[PDB]
């Protein structure tokens, strides 16, 4: 069957319940069935998902799975290997034979890797000085990923290493082996990690949002320092002490100086929040693996939401020289102009809530129009290049047979098989 | 309409063998027991016992799909032993294991009732 | 009315509060008391619409407590079997068999025999 | 909208932004400061007609 | 509409406890104190009684056919 | 043969290429197939 | 068929091609009591 | 190469629940037995409902379904009765089902609610647990609710109403000796009732070699099947299923040979 | 964001806690970061305290009396984790899950969008 | 002769040749290779391509209007 102009074919499996099942790796859909055998054969040969190409629930667990701390007992290994379709049938020798057998997560994942593919990648939390240090090969934090003969000798996997990119395990396997073998790699990762996840488990709670009292004082101290600094800038402008930059005016220059103070506070406090989270913390696990969320999201939850800019600027004076009736006239302070100093966990003040709504409203309006405009570009581009194709003379021509390019891509090579590399004869 | 009958989880389908033993050619002395109309309540019962047997090299179970309601058990043993014997012998131990538990429970249940 | 029923909206993101306003209207529940007498083309009524455990003071004035549109659930935030993605959720079959979220559906059909010709 | 009691209450207090030259020239979708205590800021339908339709504040 | 027969989570009967729950409320007992008397140690069952509304009372106002 | 649109749910057990479909939808949808001696009985029973 | 007035809730037999009105009220809305053919219900 | 001896002791026995500790048992056996209580245990509950006259505010589907959730005191009758599928019947019989009836009518001005006490059953022993009282519906003046119902044996997995367990509290290794669960801050977590540890000790020291043992069980019953009898049926029910697997297994070997 | 019921699990398969409370619904933890709010965790904490203490919690958006720390302290008095985390035993394998799940009585509503229609 | 197209067979050509052959096989067409119980028509054609027995001749139309007759056996397939 084929469904969503590029469409991906699928092999239908009958299931009892009503809703459609898709191995994503919500929205309603209709699936078309090719009646003719000729097109059915063609669809299964070129339009299949393996030739077209991981969920966020697996990448997060993958990072935990490959951690050196993870050790698997004989009983646990049996379940994980059972779901492995590409298994030779022989249980690998345990890393720690005595006092009791204990298979490391990488050993189980080594069989998941198909064939013999070699690549080197780095974990997200990989210190720069670590590579220059003497412990580059023996990573103190297991932040370096190296695969030899299809075995993950070291390194914790993540989106950078396992996720799609210029260089990744899935990408290397696709070029080295192909699409059919690569699909099994996706299936093995999803199945095996899911079974292991039932043992380790992934969760989230208030404890992740609750940080140590030491960091709370630092966050408030930075917020207090930023607030005092903004007042000092306002006082300088009030007394005409502030001098405008030659490339800007006084009113715009003041808005720039205040923005940096507030912007810097969010980043500095937000960065401290990232260091605050412990390894066991679930918030850190998501961002460290890079699966879902972002460091900014944690910053708004723990440290500070940040400035709520409207139309690229701070909250405008909707009323007479005042953002809201509560604030005095011609007030350019943090609270008045929409600076949100309270994190989501702590709770926003009544003034901040409306300012937050104003900022969110702009995003929703932009998102609503962004999809409408972006979708228009996609259809327009396809029509103007629908007839563009590569002929048998290795030339790009349209329906009228006009030569658009002598060779496809000026080289005559497909854009999928090409791999990124850096020749070292010019630097 | 499309909701499967609730009793199909345990009810045996007409003209469908409950147990099927399939030999595995990937490694010698390996067999697959594709039991039907069963859940993890039965898969873990035999896997753990099979591990206790020293003559078992690899034993495990998995469910291809929960809605399928069929469990697959893979057992591998030493050349002298056989996976088929491992599955048969393990079951007998469970029956004995539960018999002692059931019998001992009846011994202790009356003790608490009287005091 | 729709934003009031939300606890800790300040703790919540602005798009999420806006998103709820749409979802709250789409929520199914007891809309009025005299639903049996009237005839509506579409009317979804919940089996056990119970007042929430966490309710806002303004909820009393909206009378949403009297006619709620949902059932509280003991939700455990975990990744179980990997059957739930970002847009998904896992339920308890036994709970549904006890009336966890079951609801009725009413569709009214109208017709008249008129002497047009 | 009689699907839910809350929806019925919101619909009765529903508001519509001006249409024509007045609405076209202005930015009805954008949330203004005057809405504080008069029109609910959070409540607005999602889609192309975002911010055009609003709801009256409770008080 | 009416109190469910049993807890949706575990299955403990809660319908019969509704009649005693209301009777205890008018007996100067606290909202949480009444739950303890009925014997609802789990918070799942206490939810079914503490935060339940009995809509059938208003429906019974209308006369039948 | 366009089918009736239905919601989408995840299923990690299924392969990425594979797609789950209900019995009712598949019943309405039909796939013309040319009968051959090698599968004459298969069409005869169906 | 036998119908029920929407105001007094009393039985009133109305035949085919007969004006729909309650003798005791004049009400113009009538309901149907129930069908004698019972159905099967399963607690699911 | 054989199984162990599951020694079991009982802590406290009461009508609502029974607490017992099983020692020298594998984790899989203990965990499986926990779910055997919920699903495998068969109990008698109302499944076939037919209404002869329903004038209550609630609908027939809602009223008919609610009866199923009401537990029935089937202590030994469930064992002697058999499933409708395996019986030689096309219609419910006493040997593969029981008769239930509920004929009530409200004529008083004051609101009258029909409860499980008015639910009459032909079998004297098979009766509602309360027979305070499980109220079914509230009836207005002039409202009647006459219906006939039947109850049949069924597995817990088939429907939740056939689940006699009102929450099974299964615990093992309360002190976290084997570190099967790791706490980021063990001090904050409270001490479990079964744990034997001092106030100043967050958790017991890790043991390099060990296995799960001394499983704590607290089977809470809904009143249909006594908590002291559910375990007996569950253990026999689980193993009788295990033996059935062996019988079919022998046939497969007979085919291979 | 609305989440479709990815799978329905029987009470046995659901992850039960020490006291034997299988969650009615399990949601994906990866939703909390971006297309969810901390209010869900706070509401779960308030729901646990409200149910345990038998008092309907206050959901005033700007009430300084209600705080996350205050709710956590109240929960600890009823023999529960201050942050609401609980040890959930996996239904399939009885071994304790390494991560302690966060479970609470969160209010949920059923949307009109249904597969049957 | 004097053919300037690539000796290899493109993926599109392979898909169509197998699809057309498979459709022909399902229409009681003869099979050059030996049959060892392969019921599915696609498998029958797949091995035919491997053994270089498919009678289909690919006529690649050049953009200038000229055509080149390339046999499936002559073309170098990838296995
Ligand atoms: Zn409960
Ligand atoms: Zn009348
Ligand atoms: Zn019979």
TrEMBL record, chain B:
Family matches, as Pfam families: RNA_pol_L_2
An individual GO BP term: transcription by RNA polymerase II
Keywords carried by this UniProt record: DNA-directed RNA polymerase, Nucleus, Transcription
Cellular component terms per the entry's GO annotation: RNA polymerase II, core complex
GO molecular function: DNA binding; DNA-directed RNA polymerase activity; protein dimerization activity
SUPFAM superfamilies the UniProt entry points to: RBP11-like subunits of RNA polymerase
Key word Transferase present: no
Domain DNA-directed RNA polymerase RBP11-like dimerisation: start-end pairs: 31-103
Cell compartments where the protein resides: Nucleus
Similarity remark: Belongs to the archaeal Rpo11/eukaryotic RPB11/RPC19 RNA polymerase subunit family.
Identification of the protein by name: DNA-directed RNA polymerase II subunit RPB11-a
Annotated organism of origin: Sus scrofa
Lineage of the species this protein comes from: Eukaryota, Metazoa, Chordata, Craniata, Vertebrata
Automatic annotation (TrEMBL), chain G:
Binding site for Zn(2+) 2: 8, 22
GO function term, MF aspect, one: zinc ion binding
The keyword Repeat belongs to this UniProt entry's keyword annotation: no
Binding-site positions, Zn(2+) 6: 27
Residues that bind Zn(2+) 3: 22
Ligand binding (Zn(2+) 1): 5, 8, 22, 24-25
Cellular compartments annotated: Nucleus, Nucleolus
SS bonds (residue pairs): 5-22, 5-25, 8-25, 22-25
UniProt record similarity statement: Belongs to the archaeal Rpo12/eukaryotic RPC10 RNA polymerase subunit family.
Protein's recorded name: DNA-directed RNA polymerases I, II, and III subunit RPABC4
The organism of origin for this protein: Sus scrofa
Residues of the full protein shown: 15 to 58 of 58
TrEMBL record, chain H:
Example GO BP: DNA-templated transcription
Positions bound to Zn(2+): 87, 89, 93, 95-96
GO molecular-function terms, A-Z: DNA binding; DNA-directed RNA polymerase activity; protein dimerization activity
Domain DNA-directed RNA polymerase RpoA/D/Rpb3-type: 17-248
Taxonomic lineage: Eukaryota, Metazoa, Chordata, Craniata, Vertebrata
Function as written in the Swiss-Prot or TrEMBL entry: Core component of RNA polymerase II (Pol II), a DNA-dependent RNA polymerase which synthesizes mRNA precursors and many functional non-coding RNAs using the four ribonucleoside triphosphates as substrates.
Residues of the full protein shown: 47 to 316 of 320
Similarity comment: family membership: Belongs to the archaeal Rpo3/eukaryotic RPB3 RNA polymerase subunit family.
Keywords on record: DNA-directed RNA polymerase, Metal-binding, Nucleus, Phosphoprotein, Transcription, Zinc
Protein's name in the database: DNA-directed RNA polymerase II subunit RPB3
GO cellular component: DNA-directed RNA polymerase complex; nucleoplasm
Subcellular localization: Nucleus
Region annotation Disordered: where it falls in the sequence: 189-212
Major location category of this protein: nucleus
Top-level taxon: Eukaryota
From TrEMBL, chain I:
Compartments reported by the entry: Nucleus
Function per UniProt: RNA-dependent RNA polymerase that catalyzes the extension of a non-coding RNA (ncRNA) at the 3'-end using the four ribonucleoside triphosphates as substrates. An internal ncRNA sequence near the 3'-end serves as a template in a single-round Pol II-mediated RNA polymerization reaction. May decrease the stability of ncRNAs that repress Pol II-mediated gene transcription.
Similarity-based family: Belongs to the RNA polymerase beta chain family.
Protein name: DNA-directed RNA polymerase subunit beta
Organism, scientific name: Sus scrofa domesticus (domestic pig)
